[PDB]
Design a protein around this motif. Structure first.
Motif, short mmCIF file in Angstrom:
data_model
loop_
_atom_site.label_atom_id
_atom_site.label_comp_id
_atom_site.label_asym_id
_atom_site.label_seq_id
_atom_site.Cartn_x
_atom_site.Cartn_y
_atom_site.Cartn_z
N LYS A 11 0.86 -1.19 0.00
CA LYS A 11 0.00 0.00 0.00
C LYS A 11 0.90 1.26 0.00
O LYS A 11 0.45 2.38 -0.30
CB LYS A 11 -1.01 -0.04 1.16
CG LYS A 11 -2.34 0.69 0.92
CD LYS A 11 -2.55 1.96 1.77
CE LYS A 11 -1.79 1.95 3.10
NZ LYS A 11 -2.42 1.03 4.09
N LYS A 14 2.02 1.57 -3.67
CA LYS A 14 0.90 1.92 -4.50
C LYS A 14 0.48 3.34 -4.19
O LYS A 14 -0.16 3.99 -5.00
CB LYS A 14 -0.26 0.91 -4.41
CG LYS A 14 -0.26 -0.18 -5.50
CD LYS A 14 -1.69 -0.62 -5.83
CE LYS A 14 -1.81 -2.15 -5.92
NZ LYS A 14 -3.19 -2.64 -6.17
N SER A 15 0.86 3.85 -3.02
CA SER A 15 0.61 5.25 -2.75
C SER A 15 1.35 6.05 -3.83
O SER A 15 0.84 7.03 -4.32
CB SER A 15 1.03 5.66 -1.33
OG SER A 15 2.36 6.17 -1.21
N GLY A 17 2.12 4.79 -6.83
CA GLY A 17 1.61 4.50 -8.17
C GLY A 17 2.05 3.18 -8.76
O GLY A 17 1.94 3.00 -9.98
N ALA A 18 2.53 2.24 -7.94
CA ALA A 18 2.62 0.90 -8.45
C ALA A 18 1.20 0.41 -8.64
O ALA A 18 0.21 1.03 -8.18
CB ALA A 18 3.36 -0.01 -7.50
N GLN A 19 1.09 -0.73 -9.31
CA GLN A 19 -0.19 -1.30 -9.62
C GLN A 19 -0.02 -2.80 -9.83
O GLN A 19 -0.86 -3.44 -10.48
CB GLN A 19 -0.76 -0.63 -10.87
CG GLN A 19 0.26 -0.37 -11.98
CD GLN A 19 -0.33 0.41 -13.14
OE1 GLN A 19 0.17 1.47 -13.54
NE2 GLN A 19 -1.42 -0.10 -13.68
N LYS A 20 1.06 -3.36 -9.27
CA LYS A 20 1.40 -4.78 -9.48
C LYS A 20 1.50 -5.56 -8.11
O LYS A 20 0.79 -5.22 -7.17
CB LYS A 20 2.64 -4.82 -10.39
CG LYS A 20 2.51 -3.92 -11.64
CD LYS A 20 3.81 -3.51 -12.31
CE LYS A 20 4.80 -4.66 -12.32
NZ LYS A 20 6.17 -4.38 -12.88
N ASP A 21 2.33 -6.60 -8.00
CA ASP A 21 2.59 -7.30 -6.72
C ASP A 21 3.99 -7.80 -6.83
O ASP A 21 4.59 -8.31 -5.87
CB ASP A 21 1.79 -8.59 -6.62
CG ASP A 21 0.40 -8.37 -6.12
OD1 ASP A 21 -0.48 -9.17 -6.50
OD2 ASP A 21 0.20 -7.40 -5.36
N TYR A 23 8.00 -7.19 -8.51
CA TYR A 23 8.98 -6.06 -8.64
C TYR A 23 10.44 -6.53 -8.50
O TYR A 23 10.74 -7.27 -7.57
CB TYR A 23 8.78 -5.08 -7.47
CG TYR A 23 7.35 -4.57 -7.28
CD1 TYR A 23 6.46 -5.17 -6.37
CD2 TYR A 23 6.89 -3.47 -8.01
CE1 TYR A 23 5.14 -4.69 -6.23
CE2 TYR A 23 5.60 -2.98 -7.86
CZ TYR A 23 4.72 -3.58 -6.99
OH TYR A 23 3.43 -3.04 -6.90
N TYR A 31 10.42 3.03 -6.78
CA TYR A 31 9.21 3.48 -6.13
C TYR A 31 9.50 4.04 -4.74
O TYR A 31 8.93 5.09 -4.36
CB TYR A 31 8.24 2.34 -6.10
CG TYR A 31 7.42 2.22 -7.38
CD1 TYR A 31 6.62 3.28 -7.80
CD2 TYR A 31 7.41 1.02 -8.15
CE1 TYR A 31 5.81 3.18 -8.92
CE2 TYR A 31 6.61 0.90 -9.28
CZ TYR A 31 5.80 1.99 -9.67
OH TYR A 31 4.98 1.97 -10.80
#
Ligand SMILES: Cc1c(Cl)ccc2c(/C=C3\NC(=O)N(Cc4ccc(F)c(F)c4)C3=O)c[nH]c12
Ligand SMILES: Cc1c(Cl)ccc2c(/C=C3\NC(=O)N(Cc4ccc(F)c(F)c4)C3=O)c[nH]c12
Lengths: 84, 85
Positions: A11, A14-15, A17-21, A23, A31
């Protein structure tokens, strides 16, 4: 060589701007920079030092400060967030 | 807020690290400079405030080899040369 950040971390990424799981390190650290750049968590005088008590990030490392310079340990802290 | 009007030079660059508007604030352009300098790793590994633009579209548009993010007034000078406003 992809990975997965335990709920919290993910989280965090993704704050910013990732959008995956999944990396690569090199891909994750990118990121992190985002998080630290958008959040002026670096010190302005000591510009390689980062400052995290107060922040979510603080928790994740259990430090309230660190320096990017030293890799030996910047990884540690991150494993400790990966389902790794 | 106080928008500002950038030259044809600059703008190309921003466009490389995302940006959209043909209209931007100070705090907006330093935002993208910020990103560019980051992604194309141009600061120094040991000296984190110092930024080497030797070689790069940026330096050719600041007309310099390098520069310190410390010098405050001083980054402002450079910034300007790239504003049609
Ligand atoms: C350790 C660490 C990590 Cl991981 C990630 C980012 C940074 C970092 C970022 C910045 N320092 C700074 O002054 N700005 C403002 C800025 C923007 C455009 C300019 F052109 C400029 F001169 C100044 C930054 O964005 C400083 N230490 C960091
Ligand atoms: C002035 C200035 C501008 Cl303008 C733009 C970017 C930077 C900047 C970027 C970084 N410093 C750093 O050490 N890394 C690597 C890194 C990333 C995430 C981590 F979590 C981490 F521990 C280590 C960076 O990406 C340092 N000064 C800058």
């Amino acid at each position: 060589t992809l990975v997965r950040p335990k709920p919290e971390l993910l989280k965090l990424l993704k704050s910013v701007g990732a959008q995956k799981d999944t990396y690569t390190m090199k891909e994750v650290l990118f990121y992190l920079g985002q998080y630290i750049m958008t959040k002026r968590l670096y010190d302005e005088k000591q510009q390689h030092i980062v400052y995290c008590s107060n922040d979510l990030l603080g928790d994740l490392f259990g430090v309230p400060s660190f320096s990017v310079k030293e890799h030996r340990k910047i990884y540690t802290m991150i494993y400790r967030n990966l389902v790794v």
